[PDB]
Design a protein around this ligand. Structure first.
Ligand SMILES: NC(=O)c1ccc[n+]([C@@H]2O[C@H](COP(=O)([O-])OP(=O)(O)OC[C@H]3O[C@@H](n4cnc5c(N)ncnc54)[C@H](OP(=O)(O)O)[C@@H]3O)[C@@H](O)[C@H]2O)c1
Ligand SMILES: NC(=O)c1ccc[n+]([C@@H]2O[C@H](COP(=O)([O-])OP(=O)(O)OC[C@H]3O[C@@H](n4cnc5c(N)ncnc54)[C@H](OP(=O)(O)O)[C@@H]3O)[C@@H](O)[C@H]2O)c1
Lengths: 314, 314
C-alpha cells in the first residue's frame, strides 16, 4: 500500500479527499491534526517526514477565508500559506517523497483574465486586491512545485479549483462565498416564512461552481495519472491543471435553484442598485478533460446533497 | 543610536550599505555572518531578534546568481529566498522591529513590460523564464512587506534596483552579468595583447546600470524618509521604489567605455549573428526623484573606480 499524507485532512477539500481514499485498500492514510502537527513549524514538519514513511502528499492545508478575512488579515494569509507550502514541499523532497499534489485556487488568476481562463492566463496581469496576498502565496506554491520538478526530477503536480461547495463548508449567512451563504439564508427565510430574500446585484454575472467531492475525485485522478501522460498534457513551467466544470451559470440561476432546493416559497429579489462584479469568470478545463476526467455532480444534484448535509449538521 | 541589522552584510549590496552606515555616529550596526546565523533557520532567526535589540533591518541577504545558476538550481532560488524573507520579516514583526528595507530586483518585472518601467508594471504580465523562480520569491517578499504594513501598521519599505555593478562583484569572464564579465575580459585581453574581444549580439540593445554605492545611498535615503513622505509617494499595495538612473545606454557604448577604462587597444567586436534581447530595458525612477534622491556616479566614473577596486583585489 502507498502511504499517503493528506495535509489539512479536516478541511473542506482535505476531508473530501480523505472520504474517497479511506475507501482504498491500496492506500494507508497518514493524518495529523493541527494539534499533533503545526505545519508552520519547519522542524516539526521535517521530523514528521523523517519518521513517517510517506509515499505521497496531498497538500490540502492552508489558511483560507472570505472577503473580509483576506482584507483584514493580509499578512496572516501570505505568511502562513508561504510557510506551510515551503515546509511541506522542502521536507518532502529532503525525505525522498516523489509525489505531491498541491492545491491552488481560481481566484489567483488575473482580475481581467481572458474567459474562459486557460492555465496560461496565470501571471498574465494584476490580481484582485482582496485576494492578492493569498494568491501570491498560492502562486509561489505552484512555482515551488515546478522548481523542485525541474531541479530534482520530482513529481509535484498542482490543481487549480474553481469555486467549491459541499459538505464541511461554513454555512453562515454572512459568508462571502455565495453557495453556503445563500443555502443558509434561504434555509432561514424558509423557516421564518420571510416574504423575500434580497441578493445584492442584478444577478446577471456568470460564475462556475464545482462540488467538493468532484474536486477530490479530480485531484486523486490527477495525482495518479502515469507521469508520462501528465507530462504530455502540461509544461514544466506551466504545470497546473484547472479543475471545474467549464460551464457558467448566472447568479440569478444559482439563487433561483437554491431557493427551489430548500423549498422556499417567498420571492428571490435582486437589488440592481448594487454593483455587479465582472460579467463572466470560469475556468477552461480542456487539459483536465484531455486527461480523461469529467465532473459527475450537476449543480441541482450537488446543491440538494449539500443542503441535506447541512440539515444533518446544523 | 539606532540598532541596525544589515542581513547579508558581506554581500555586494549589503557591504555597500555597511560601508556607508559604519560612518554614522547615530547608528550601531548589528552584523552576523552566515556561519553565526543561518537565515534559513526560523528558530535561529527568531532567537536573534528576541535577544538583540533591533530598531531597523536592511534585508540584503539572498541567494543570487546569474543565468546558468537560476536555470540550473531553480528550487534553491525560490525556496531559499522565500524562507530568508519569511523568517526575517516574521521575526522582525514578532519582536517589534517597525522599520525594514527589503531589496527587490528589476529582473522581476514582466518580460514585456512597458519602458521605462514604472513601479506599476509589477505583475502586469509574465516573467522571464530564466528568473521566474527567483522573481516570484522576490515578489512574495514585497507582498509580505505590504501585508505586514497593512495588517499591523508596520513600516516595511522596499527598493527595486536596476542592474548593479561595483566593488565586491564577481569578476570572472564567464559571469552572465555584462559589467563584471566585460571588465574581466577586457582586462585579460589587454594583458594578453589580444587583437579583439568579441561580444555576442549587435550591441544595439539599451540597458541601465547603477553603481552599488549609489544603490546603497538610495536605500539608506528611502529607509530614513519620514513615514508620511514615504506614504505620499507610494501606495500600500504598490509600495516599492525603483532605484536606478532612468537613463539607457547601448551595450555597444558600455563595451566601448569598458575598453577605454581598462586601456585596451585592440578592437571591440560585436557578433550580430547572435541574438539580441529586447531593445530596451530600464526603470522609470520618477518616484525616487520625487522623493529627493538622484544618483551621483556616472557610468564612466563608476566603471573606472570599479576597475580600480578589481585591480586592488585580484
Ligand atoms: N474555488 C477555489 O479557488 C477554492 C476553494 C476551496 C478550496 N480551494 C483549495 O483548497 C485549499 C483548502 O481549502 P479548504 O476550504 O479545504 O480549507 P479549510 O478547508 O477551510 O482548511 C484547510 C485546513 O488545513 C488546516 N491547517 C491550516 N493551517 C494549519 C497549520 N498551520 N497546521 C496544520 N493544519 C493547518 C486547517 O486547520 P484548522 O482549520 O482547523 O485551522 C484546516 O483544517 C484552498 O486553500 C485552495 O488551495 C480552492
Ligand atoms: N539589478 C538587480 O536587479 C540587482 C542586483 C544585485 C542585487 N540586487 C538586490 O540585492 C540583493 C542582494 O544582492 P547581492 O549581489 O548583494 O547578493 P550577494 O551580494 O551575492 O549575497 C548576499 C548575501 O546574503 C548572504 N546569505 C545568503 N543566504 C544566507 C543565509 N541562508 N544565511 C545568511 N546569510 C545568507 C550570502 O551569504 P554567502 O553569500 O556568503 O553565501 C551573501 O553574503 C539581490 O537579491 C537583489 O534583491 C538587485
Amino acid at each position: 500500500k502507498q502511504r499517503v499524507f493528506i495535509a489539512g485532512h479536516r478541511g473542506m477539500v482535505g476531508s473530501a479527499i480523505r472520504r474517497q481514499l479511506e475507501q482504498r485498500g491500496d492506500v494507508e492514510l497518514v493524518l495529523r491534526t493541527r494539534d499533533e502537527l503545526n505545519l508552520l513549524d519547519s522542524r516539526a514538519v521535517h521530523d514528521f517526514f523523517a519518521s513517517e514513511r510517506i509515499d505521497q502528499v496531498y497538500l490540502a492545508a492552508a489558511k483560507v477565508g472570505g472577503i473580509v478575512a483576506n482584507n483584514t488579515y493580509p499578512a496572516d494569509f501570505i505568511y502562513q500559506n508561504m510557510m506551510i507550502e515551503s515546509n511541506i514541499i522542502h521536507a518532502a523532497h529532503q525525505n525522498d517523497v516523489n509525489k505531491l499534489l498541491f492545491l491552488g485556487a481560481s481566484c489567483i488568476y488575473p482580475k481581467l483574465a481572458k474567459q474562459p481562463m486557460a492555465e496560461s492566463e496565470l501571471l498574465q496581469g494584476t490580481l484582485e486586491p482582496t485576494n492578492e496576498p493569498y494568491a501570491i502565496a498560492k502562486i509561489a506554491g505552484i512555482k515551488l512545485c515546478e522548481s523542485y520538478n525541474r531541479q530534482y526530477g520530482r513529481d509535484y503536480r498542482s490543481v487549480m479549483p474553481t469555486n467549491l461547495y459541499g459538505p464541511h463548508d461554513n454555512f453562515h449567512p454572512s459568508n462571502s462565498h455565495v453557495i453556503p451563504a445563500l443555502l443558509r439564508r434561504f434555509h432561514e427565510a424558509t423557516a421564518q416564512s420571510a416574504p423575500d430574500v434580497v441578493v445584492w446585484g442584478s444577478g446577471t454575472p456568470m460564475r462556475e461552481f464545482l462540488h467538493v467531492d468532484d474536486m477530490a475525485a479530480a485531484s486523486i485522478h490527477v495525482m495518479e495519472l502515469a507521469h508520462e501522460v501528465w507530462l504530455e498534457n502540461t509544461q514544466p513551467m506551466l504545470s497546473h491543471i484547472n479543475v471545474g466544470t467549464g460551464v457558467d451559470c448566472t447568479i440569478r440561476e444559482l439563487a433561483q435553484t437554491i431557493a427551489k432546493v430548500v423549498g422556499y416559497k417567498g420571492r428571490v429579489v435582486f437589488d440592481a442598485s448594487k454593483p455587479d462584479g465582472t460579467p463572466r469568470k470560469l475556468l477552461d478545463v480542456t487539459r483536465l478533460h484531455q486527461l480523461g476526467w469529467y465532473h459527475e455532480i450537476s449543480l441541482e444534484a450537488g446543491l440538494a446533497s449539500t443542503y441535506q448535509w447541512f440539515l444533518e449538521n446544523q
